[PDB]
Amino acid sequence: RHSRRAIAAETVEILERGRYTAPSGRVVPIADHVAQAVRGTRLYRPEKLAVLLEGLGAASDGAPTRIEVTEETTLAAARRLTGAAGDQVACLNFASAEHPGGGFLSGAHAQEEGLARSSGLYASLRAVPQFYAFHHRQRDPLYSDHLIYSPGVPVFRDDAGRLLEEPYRVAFLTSPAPNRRAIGDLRTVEEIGRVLRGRAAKVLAAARHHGHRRLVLGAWGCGVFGNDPAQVAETFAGLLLDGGPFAGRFAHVVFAVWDTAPGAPRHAAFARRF
């Protein structure tokens, strides 16, 4: 936890200073890109996303969607796609509903924190207090369909925390999965499923609306929040497969599921389904 805490503080300083030093000694500027990402950050309210959804697709098929299930971290998958083509990749941030970047500054270890230690994501999210205040006042573990869209966020660390010689940019989509853990059995499997489907549909709608043809998804809400990885995989499958609303709408979707737990159960659930 202490090493991650140090890296987080370093990232915040880097975001403040607007530059960092790569392993080669190169001093890399990022202030312009961070500032652009912040100025371009938008909060989408649930009803707004619902409209983006009621403006449902109506296009043809330039190609059949490539779907991959990998053991990559979110950012490893994004970096790989980014090197392969020039269109900006979008990544789902498995967001805390209450704290921008989750517990990254305290050294917590989960996907949002990895994103926050490795990029300008915190500068974007910290600028949308309305998202966090809404949930603090709600005190309901289902949270809401609110989403933060963060365009062109600079990414400048690898999985090991090493600063990059050459940073790259991705868009982030920040949407909290329901806290199934706090809910327990007081909502039905089907109720949770409906919440997941509606919210995932809005994430996909926002991505498509902002012109992202390539996405990095994964086991959204399957950490501390305790969602069922099979149900989450099924949620995305219903949207992307068997003639679902987003079938054929993306060029490439990666379910990047790095699971250190024994048996990598989150990964297995996605590999099974896709």
**Sign of dihedral through CA atoms 37, 173, 21, 84?**
negative
**Distance between CA 142 and CA 42 in Å, rounded?**
22
Answer whether CATH 3.30.70.2740 is correct for domain 1-274.
Answer: no
Q: What interhelical angle do 229-240 and 265-273 show, nearest 10?
A: 30
Domain boundaries, the chain: 1-274
Q: What interhelical angle do 189-209 and 229-240 show, nearest 10?
A: 50
Question: At a CB cut-off of 8 Å and minimum separation 6, what does 198 contact?
Answer: 145
**Distance between CA 100 and CA 115 in Å, rounded?**
11
Q: How many CB atoms lie within 10 A of CB 94?
A: 26
- Experimental determination technique: X-ray
Closest Cα to residue 52, out of 194, 161, 207? 207
Backbone phi and psi for residue 240, each to the nearest 5 degrees, phi listed first: -105, -20
Integer angstrom CA distances of residue 81 from 28, 94, 132, 224, 258? 22, 20, 31, 28, 16
Per the structure block, which two tokens stand in for 97? 């509903």
**Distance between CA 77 and CA 252 in Å, rounded?**
11
Residue located via tokens 């012109």? 211
Task: Give the experimental resolution in Å.
Answer: 1.5
Integer angstrom CA distances of residue 192 from 37, 74, 180, 196? 33, 24, 8, 6
Closest Cα to residue 95, out of 194, 34, 178, 181? 178
CB burial readout 164-176, b (16+ within 10 A) else e: beebbbbbbbbbb
**For the chain, after which residues does the C atom lie more than 2.5 Å from the next written residue's N, i.e. where is it broken?**
none
Identify the helix (H) or strand (E) that includes residue 19. Answer: strand 19-21
In the chain, what's the furthest Cα-to-Cα distance? 55
